[PDB]
Design an enzyme around this catalytic site. Structure first.
Site, PDB file in Angstrom:
ATOM      1  N   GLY A  28       0.827  -1.211   0.000  1.00 58.20           N
ATOM      2  CA  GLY A  28       0.000   0.000   0.000  1.00 58.20           C
ATOM      3  C   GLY A  28       0.853   1.250   0.000  1.00 58.20           C
ATOM      4  O   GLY A  28       1.883   1.282  -0.652  1.00 58.20           O
ATOM      5  N   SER A  71       4.798  -5.651  -2.280  1.00 61.76           N
ATOM      6  CA  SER A  71       5.043  -4.197  -2.366  1.00 61.76           C
ATOM      7  C   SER A  71       5.763  -3.663  -1.097  1.00 61.76           C
ATOM      8  O   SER A  71       6.832  -4.161  -0.745  1.00 61.76           O
ATOM      9  CB  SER A  71       3.720  -3.465  -2.690  1.00 61.76           C
ATOM     10  OG  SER A  71       3.854  -2.050  -2.686  1.00 61.76           O
ATOM     11  N   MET A  72       5.152  -2.719  -0.391  1.00 66.86           N
ATOM     12  CA  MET A  72       5.689  -2.185   0.862  1.00 66.86           C
ATOM     13  C   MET A  72       5.657  -3.223   2.001  1.00 66.86           C
ATOM     14  O   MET A  72       6.420  -3.124   2.960  1.00 66.86           O
ATOM     15  CB  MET A  72       4.868  -0.942   1.242  1.00 66.86           C
ATOM     16  CG  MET A  72       5.599   0.253   1.839  1.00 66.86           C
ATOM     17  SD  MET A  72       7.219   0.748   1.231  1.00 66.86           S
ATOM     18  CE  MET A  72       7.010   0.552  -0.544  1.00 66.86           C
ATOM     19  N   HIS A  80       8.190  -5.200  -6.448  1.00 65.63           N
ATOM     20  CA  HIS A  80       7.995  -4.442  -7.682  1.00 65.63           C
ATOM     21  C   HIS A  80       8.323  -2.955  -7.475  1.00 65.63           C
ATOM     22  O   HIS A  80       8.724  -2.567  -6.379  1.00 65.63           O
ATOM     23  CB  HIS A  80       6.573  -4.689  -8.286  1.00 65.63           C
ATOM     24  CG  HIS A  80       5.430  -4.093  -7.516  1.00 65.63           C
ATOM     25  ND1 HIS A  80       5.588  -3.340  -6.369  1.00 65.63           N
ATOM     26  CD2 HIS A  80       4.096  -4.125  -7.759  1.00 65.63           C
ATOM     27  CE1 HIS A  80       4.406  -2.941  -5.940  1.00 65.63           C
ATOM     28  NE2 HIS A  80       3.483  -3.413  -6.759  1.00 65.63           N
ATOM     29  N   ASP A 126       6.485  -6.976 -11.890  1.00 69.74           N
ATOM     30  CA  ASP A 126       6.126  -7.837 -10.756  1.00 69.74           C
ATOM     31  C   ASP A 126       7.014  -9.087 -10.734  1.00 69.74           C
ATOM     32  O   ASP A 126       7.174  -9.753 -11.760  1.00 69.74           O
ATOM     33  CB  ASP A 126       4.641  -8.259 -10.834  1.00 69.74           C
ATOM     34  CG  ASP A 126       3.671  -7.124 -10.485  1.00 69.74           C
ATOM     35  OD1 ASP A 126       4.112  -5.998 -10.174  1.00 69.74           O
ATOM     36  OD2 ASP A 126       2.451  -7.378 -10.518  1.00 69.74           O
TER      37      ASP A 126
END
Ligand SMILES: CC(C)C[C@H]1C(=O)N(Cc2cccc3ccccc23)C[C@@H]2N(C(=O)NCc3ccccc3)CCC(=O)N21
Ligand SMILES: CC(C)C[C@H]1C(=O)N(Cc2cccc3ccccc23)C[C@@H]2N(C(=O)NCc3ccccc3)CCC(=O)N21
Ligand SMILES: CC(C)C[C@H]1C(=O)N(Cc2cccc3ccccc23)C[C@@H]2N(C(=O)NCc3ccccc3)CCC(=O)N21
Ligand SMILES: CC(C)C[C@H]1C(=O)N(Cc2cccc3ccccc23)C[C@@H]2N(C(=O)NCc3ccccc3)CCC(=O)N21
Ligand SMILES: CC(C)C[C@H]1C(=O)N(Cc2cccc3ccccc23)C[C@@H]2N(C(=O)NCc3ccccc3)CCC(=O)N21
Ligand SMILES: CC(C)C[C@H]1C(=O)N(Cc2cccc3ccccc23)C[C@@H]2N(C(=O)NCc3ccccc3)CCC(=O)N21
Ligand SMILES: CC(C)C[C@H]1C(=O)N(Cc2cccc3ccccc23)C[C@@H]2N(C(=O)NCc3ccccc3)CCC(=O)N21
Ligand SMILES: CC(C)C[C@H]1C(=O)N(Cc2cccc3ccccc23)C[C@@H]2N(C(=O)NCc3ccccc3)CCC(=O)N21
Ligand SMILES: CC(C)C[C@H]1C(=O)N(Cc2cccc3ccccc23)C[C@@H]2N(C(=O)NCc3ccccc3)CCC(=O)N21
Lengths: 189, 188, 186, 186, 191, 184, 191, 190, 189
Positions: H66, H95-96, H120, H169
């Site tokens: 997010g 992600s994060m 990513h 990705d």
């Protein structure tokens, strides 16, 4: 909305309820019938607690319903205690009207607070005679607001009419000069 | 919308255009600025064709824009030919106003046609002084409509005010008695 | 929209155009302005001497599109008569006033309204400033030209256009927006 | 849209096209560009010597569609006059400036606006980079050509297009976007 | 919202995690600043003063900003009360959030190493008549001068430089925010 | 859309009388069918004379694009391709498919090349099928672009991975066009 | 959709491009197959027969398919009429579109080199009571047998191979379609 | 969300299951990372430090990632506090979320066997004038360099390799994440 | 959701029905599996281990399945903890729900007589560039192999048979699920 716990010889309060224990009422939103009813009920209760001690009315409101506003106004005037009014952030429309309705000499605003005054807003739809009725009504309610503002600022009805024609933004200092408040509350020493 | 053919010494017409060739104008819908402009243009054209001969204005309309209505009204009065008005089905609001604006003695309605009169409708939103302006405006427009209706029906301004306060449905026969029309057009 | 036939078939509005009558009968947007401009240029090429008749039944609209019509009226050689029927408001009443001197008319129950231009601005403070300066400069521009063509002062027009101002045809004559109220014939 | 009969029948815009007048009167998209391009090519084939007149009342639009019109104007043999009536903004004012040297006009109350190109980018950081590089390269391209045709420097155009910049017709002449304000007979 | 239970000599108390931070004089400004959020923060600040007018208060800031007027409710209340209000930017402080970050007590304005600080002009809107748009435009411009003047006072930068630097969105690192004067120190990790 | 009289023609139909076909919009099956029908007709009129394909398109359907491509290659006349404004995606593919030596672009026209876009939803084997399909259609497009630009399949793959904007001049160097059409 | 004007010895006639193709016995199946498209194609086929019952008809196919029922309106009419109907796949022929491609006259079913042919099972839906779903399921399955039987007859492949091969979406090259028996030749350019 | 009741010497205390995990120094990062989730996690971390500045904290991660900014609120607070913060990827960290997985205390970054780790580039958006899009593009690119630099420091991979590997990705198995340096061990069953 | 009160001789406690089941080491997986549901189940499993690492846990399953990733959060936590986790399918276990049914402790995987078990392939989506679709397709296929491999290990069926049998939706009776190896017994009344 955070909770605070107060110790004795221990009661839990939501922060706003705790302010109410010290006779501080928060008018911090758009004025509708709900907000008015709550404020009215708080004012009546604080009187029953102590009819001598000051009440503090915090105002950060863009205004709203004129009629709901006058519920608050009439209840402030009716009760025995002085109601201090303190404008923090913003007081606009009926909010700045109520700011001016605070007890004589105890109407305040913090330095960077915004005060705005204007005419009441409304609407009318239908037959010509229905629109006439609504137009007469909103105009009579403008005279009523202007008359009371005149009484409490010391400005003339004619000057208030001219000055409320279009949106009129004031600084805290300008509000003092106008008579909407008595003092700008300076930071402590 | 069907097409018909005229012969003589041959042209194709849509049915409404053919009526226009015989000096019949159709006011058959809600009165907006478009409808008014078309009717106005038809009236001006029919005058240029023949300034003596009668024009026939068919009215089956619930009314609509007062301003657009007065575009039609003023053009009717301005042109040289008599404009007959004939209410078929329904004439309401500005539609019945225009029915009454037909040439003296040539305002008709068919037996089961419905005529309705009422006050103008509008709206106002915003500041108190803005609502005042709009209220003064619609009231002045009411006086204006009532004054002209008084002139053309022969009824008093006071009676028209009372009678237009709420919706007032009239039979064709009642419209004759009121002065909105001159005759009910009977059949063969 | 009905068709009239004279060997040649015309839609009613095109037939009016054959007699040098242009219909400004709707909200003024860029399309309507372009059509009116094109009609005015064409009628000039047909005959640069003969009068043109501009019918106005419009609530107004785009200021910029309005000035397309205005500039083209002034540019062309023929006098352009302006005739307000039904209603002329906002840029519609501006254009009513822009008709050739002495040939600006309104029918008896026509409605004329004048007011300030309307607009909008959203975004950063400097963006709002730019938009505010712009609409104010366009108000001065409109007020200046109205002053020239009515004979009223810029100061009076400013006061009188502050809020919506409805005029009767007769009041419009007195004001200088039109020259005569077109009475019914004999 | 009215019809005029000259017997051949023409819609008013098609009649203007018979006299070598092209209407750019709307938002510039690929359709509008393709039509204008096709008109320009046709008018050349009719007569490669005679002037063409490009009427501009547009808020602008697609840069790429705009450059379809620009390149076709420059390619063809005839001079293309540009005449701003009402408003020329964004790519509309760019094209106003692209008219044949000495034949770029605006009527007195026409509005000219210049600004930077607008766009969007969404997705991965490298995708946003690509889109950002692209719109910036297209700004340099526009600024370079505007510099060539106004005579102003690339540096001044960059500064002056940063935020919306409204110009009067007279100011547009001084800037070099047009050659003369087309005055009326008086 | 996780509940934590504390144990003492007179009992056990249950606290939602944020209320527990408030017991240690920590106020969370962690969302878009609207009138509600401002009223809550103001009320917390006034209460913490009444508890103890000497002890420091800690204002955590992870906010994209929001209402200028609500922001000034918080600002004026910070300045009015007796205690020093520390400001600590964690994650992000943007718009009125970074204004309030700068409004912390002198020498006690912090940001953690990878926190993001952004400054820009105020945003607004106007619709209607030309004179109505003028009023709104004059108002938002006066509010820009007001914000710029106070930022100048608290960063030590000139009004002219702040105007130039806030014209468009301006992202700063924590270290850049220190150099600018929005904060006093970047809070390094402990031993 | 204006009309011109010589016999009345809408402007686009008049261009068609002079063997000019307008590909000026997003490429879908309708646009392809029209262009195909125009090409077949112009051949029947005259199988010797050049045809001119104007391109101002952001691209669109790969399959509809290949309807136009195959019809261009099939017919006897040379089909000139002229990029004005913009040629992107399948639009720039078709720009490159013009007759050898007669592929043009005007000076400020924009050419863009990228990979085909698509979608897949449902079961794992359904997504596999769709993924294999779009990858096979990428190889197909890359192979033909290689043949017509003279660039390698490997270079086209690298260069189409993300959106790649080219100037007219850059498109010439790349081999998508033969000349930038200068003004006289 | 552009207009072409054909100038001759008997006249000057104007044609929309598609109508002009129809004058040379070319029918365009260039969209999703619904009842409207089918009715038009059927009417064209019947008309072209009445014009000349000996001469070939050319059916252009660039279609993703569509209604099976509407598809069979076109199919039955092709088979009924006296002229050979050539089928030419340009761009894409999928679902009922590729079925109709295969239904062209023996030896006159073509596809251009980069055209896409796809075959799969029919798609449908059923909602309501168990016996209603049964009816709909029996119906779509009988319609699958029907399509598979005819495809078997016209490709020369077995019913059992077609069933396996149409289970999921099956994309074919023009050359693969020839090998499969859906077309007779890949139409190569002149030379 | 179920309630559990515990019996001790100072009472019988009721806990929602997540609050009970917090009593044993376990913080749940189990959703999309926004400013709310970050503020809660930050507040939990600061509180657990005040309880005991020596004892380990356990950060459970089942998140698709997010907000980058909100993510860095959590990251900076982890690094700032005295206790080691263990990170344990269960289900998914993307992600994060996978960035924060890597930010756990050295040698105490775990993932269970069938957990999914994805890395990513950051995603964003820009709309408006060319100079506005430039500002946004420069910003997201500077934020990519910042993320890549820290990932390089904590995995031991080069900035150049991380750039290449995060371009599109990139799904990793737990075992592949260990090899990459995002985690230290795959937590085997007992 | 009803409340039950345990009235004993030492300690009167109120429980919501689901929390009461949790006191007896029963976990409800009764809805679509998303990240929230997984986090709750994981947290329950970890807590029940800390209470007693010897005693059995009971996992009730009435789920249509859902997120594969969230499912594997539950799976890995089941395998990691020391107690046996019984799985009991009541009503329906589909997709990742039937996967987790099979992941119960050896010999303690149950289903009631009229419970429905369904197995199929994972579902997903991909949109954008050809290389992006490739990545998503490779990913969902790798995730299919992973699921099929573990199902093979726990049912005793081959990877090849599971692939064939999960190609389309495959509804099983409780008895058929026993024969297949997804459960060990049908729980008779
Ligand atoms: C002049 C009244 C202050 C006295 C009178 C009265 O007119 N009301 C009506 C009443 C209701 C609501 C709101 C009002 C606002 C303004 C005036 C009146 C309002 C109620 C009041 N009571 C009271 O105040 N009780 C004090 C109190 C106790 C507990 C809670 C809050 C207030 C109850 C007993 C009683 O005779 N009265
Ligand atoms: C009747 C003239 C005495 C009034 C005068 C005028 O003011 N107008 C303006 C005008 C425009 C639109 C609508 C109107 C409605 C009412 C009054 C005026 C209206 C037009 C008119 N013309 C005319 O009728 N020409 C004949 C004609 C031919 C074909 C169609 C219509 C009219 C042109 C010649 C001329 O001097 N006039
Ligand atoms: C100022 C022109 C009166 C003279 C000059 C010119 O400046 N323009 C520009 C031009 C274009 C569009 C709209 C305009 C509006 C206002 C002013 C100018 C406008 C075109 C014009 N033409 C013309 O009138 N042709 C006659 C005609 C015939 C048929 C239909 C329309 C016009 C073509 C021939 C020519 O030299 N000109
Ligand atoms: C001056 C020629 C050397 C231009 C050259 C050319 O490059 N094109 C491509 C082409 C297509 C579309 C739009 C373009 C815009 C700009 C440049 C090119 C454009 C077409 C053009 N033709 C032509 O003009 N025919 C005249 C004509 C007649 C009727 C209508 C329109 C044009 C056909 C014959 C021919 O060699 N050419
Ligand atoms: C420095 C005095 C001017 C404060 C003065 C005052 O003006 N207000 C109005 C008021 C309301 C809301 C917000 C404000 C913010 C700033 C200033 C004023 C604000 C309340 C305050 N009180 C108080 O603090 N009481 C103690 C307390 C206890 C528990 C919680 C909060 C406060 C009540 C007693 C009192 O005289 N005052
Ligand atoms: C040149 C032959 C090799 C092509 C052959 C053929 O297979 N088709 C099928 C067909 C249909 C649609 C589009 C196609 C596109 C490409 C190839 C084929 C296409 C059409 C063609 N016809 C023709 O050109 N007629 C001339 C014509 C005149 C006027 C307008 C259009 C075409 C009909 C007579 C005939 O045998 N053929
Ligand atoms: C071969 C005869 C059996 C055809 C017979 C028939 O059964 N129909 C029904 C019919 C209608 C629509 C579509 C069909 C499709 C397939 C089969 C039948 C279809 C019509 C046909 N007609 C005809 O062709 N007339 C010639 C014609 C002229 C102009 C256009 C089209 C056809 C009318 C005269 C006649 O006896 N018939
Ligand atoms: C670790 C000290 C160096 C931090 C110092 C400080 O700068 N803050 C600001 C602050 C607020 C929010 C979140 C942060 C996150 C990171 C850094 C700082 C953060 C709070 C801290 N306090 C504290 O921990 N109090 C104890 C406590 C009790 C109960 C729950 C949580 C904490 C209050 C007393 C104090 O001086 N400090
Ligand atoms: C064999 C060790 C590796 C277990 C170890 C660990 O790594 N975690 C991480 C962790 C966090 C969240 C969810 C998980 C799910 C699966 C696996 C791990 C999970 C939790 C555990 N703790 C504990 O159980 N405390 C007791 C407790 C009390 C109340 C409820 C739950 C547990 C804290 C003390 C500790 O060292 N560990």
């Amino acid at each position: 909305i955070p909770t605070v716990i107060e110790t004795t010889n221990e009661r839990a309060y939501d922060i706003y309820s705790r302010l109410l224990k010290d006779r501080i009422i928060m008018l911090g939103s758009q004025i509708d019938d709900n907000v008015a009813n709550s404020i009215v009920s708080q004012l009546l209760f604080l009187q029953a607690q102590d009819s001598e001690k000051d009440i503090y009315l915090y105002i950060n409101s863009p205004g709203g319903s004129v009629t709901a506003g006058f519920a608050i106004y009439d209840t402030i005037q009716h009760i025995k205690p002085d109601v201090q009014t303190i404008c923090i952030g913003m007081a606009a429309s009926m909010g700045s009207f109520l700011l001016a309705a605070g007890a004589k000499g105890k109407r305040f605003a913090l330095p960077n607070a915004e005060v705005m005054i204007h005419q009441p807003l409304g609407g009318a739809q239908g037959q010509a005679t229905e629109i006439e009725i609504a137009a007469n009504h909103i105009l009579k309610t403008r005279e009523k607001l202007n008359r009371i503002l005149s009484e409490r600022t010391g400005q003339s009805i004619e000057k208030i009419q001219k000055d409320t024609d279009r949106d009129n933004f004031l600084t805290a200092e300008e509000a003092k000069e106008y008579g909407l408040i008595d003092e700008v509350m300076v930071p402590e020493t």
